[PDB]
Specification:
With about 210 residues, this protein is mainly beta. Helices cover about 10% and strands about 35% of the residues. The chain has 2 helices and 9 strands, in the order βαβββαβββββ. Strands 1, 2, 3, 4, 5, 6, 7, 8 and 9 form a 9-stranded antiparallel β-sheet that branches. The chain is globular, with a radius of gyration of 18 Å. The chain binds one RNA strand of 63 nucleotides through helix 1 and strand 3. This is Type I-MYXAN CRISPR-associated protein Cas5/Cmx5/DevS. It comes from Nostoc sp. 'Peltigera membranacea cyanobiont' 210A. The PDB classes it as dna binding protein. The entry lists the keywords CRISPR, DNA recognition, DNA binding protein.
RNA sequence: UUGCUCAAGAGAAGUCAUUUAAUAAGGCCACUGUUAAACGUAGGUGAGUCGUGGCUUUAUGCC
């Protein structure tokens, strides 16, 4: 079998807001599989979200990012008038600083060719042939990606904080997100285990599937 | 195309008005640089202005 594609990721600032965190911008410690899947789709310029269902992703944290809060005058659709003062509310948003991680992409379960792994490999091979819009970001549109590159299993050859699918884990990261409400959002429970493995364990792989 | 797409904590504000580190104080009192000698005899030099004036025989020297 083809070795799973490894994508080194370095982001200066990242906000993985929680699904139920609407009054305050609480963030996940680790990028959810849904956010990484959306980032990869943006990287290959794929607008359709159902195109690459079945891809498996594994995330290894190269360091523990620090959590910080920033005030923000975020807008909302509360009043019909755009200039009404009710449309602006001040609330906190939690950000993560200096996020470095390695992403494993495995595309054995995809039924549509070419697979997401092949598309990412081709995009990195010939960047001038990639047809996409906007700037690559992880989280919010203003949180641009500093370094995204093809790496090996030992890019830093140090110690890795894996995200293991544990039913007793603390984090509840979604592998599918319903942006309207929460009906179609699908969750999985993870834990961050400090391990010196250079390849993801079996429980570290998360398959992105439709809620159906 | 990422719980995403959009998103200024923004506009304004003197740390101000007043306050002697001031009043007093000897670095003072004492001290010998005392005592003695043969010059026996042999060591040198760095810097201008230009055509007769008072004496005197031109002379040639004085001021």
């Amino acid at each position: 079998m083809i070795a799973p594609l490894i994508l080194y990721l370095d982001v200066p600032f990242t906000t993985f807001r929680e699904s139920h965190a609407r009054e305050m911008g609480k963030t996940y410690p680790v990028p959810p599989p849904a956010t990484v899947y959306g980032m990869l789709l943006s990287l290959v310029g794929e607008t359709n979200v159902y195109r690459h269902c079945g891809v498996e992703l594994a995330i290894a944290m190269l360091s523990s990012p620090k959590k910080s809060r920033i005030l923000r005058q975020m807008r909302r659709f509360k009043n019909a008038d755009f200039s009404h003062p009710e449309n602006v509310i001040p609330c906190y948003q939690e950000i993560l600083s200096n996020l470095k991680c390695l992403i494993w992409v495995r595309s054995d379960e995809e039924k549509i060719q070419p697979s997401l792994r092949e598309r990412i490999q081709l995009a990195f091979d010939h960047p001038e042939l990639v047809r996409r819009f906007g700037c690559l970001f992880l989280g919010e549109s203003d949180q641009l990606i500093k370094t995204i590159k093809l790496a090996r299993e030992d890019y830093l050859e140090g110690v890795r904080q894996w995200a293991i699918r544990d039913n007793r884990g603390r984090l509840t990261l979604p592998y599918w997100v319903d942006h309207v409400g929460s009906r179609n959002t699908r969750f999985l429970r993870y834990r961050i285990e400090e391990m010196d493995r250079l390849s993801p364990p079996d429980l570290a792989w998360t398959m992105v599937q439709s809620p159906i």
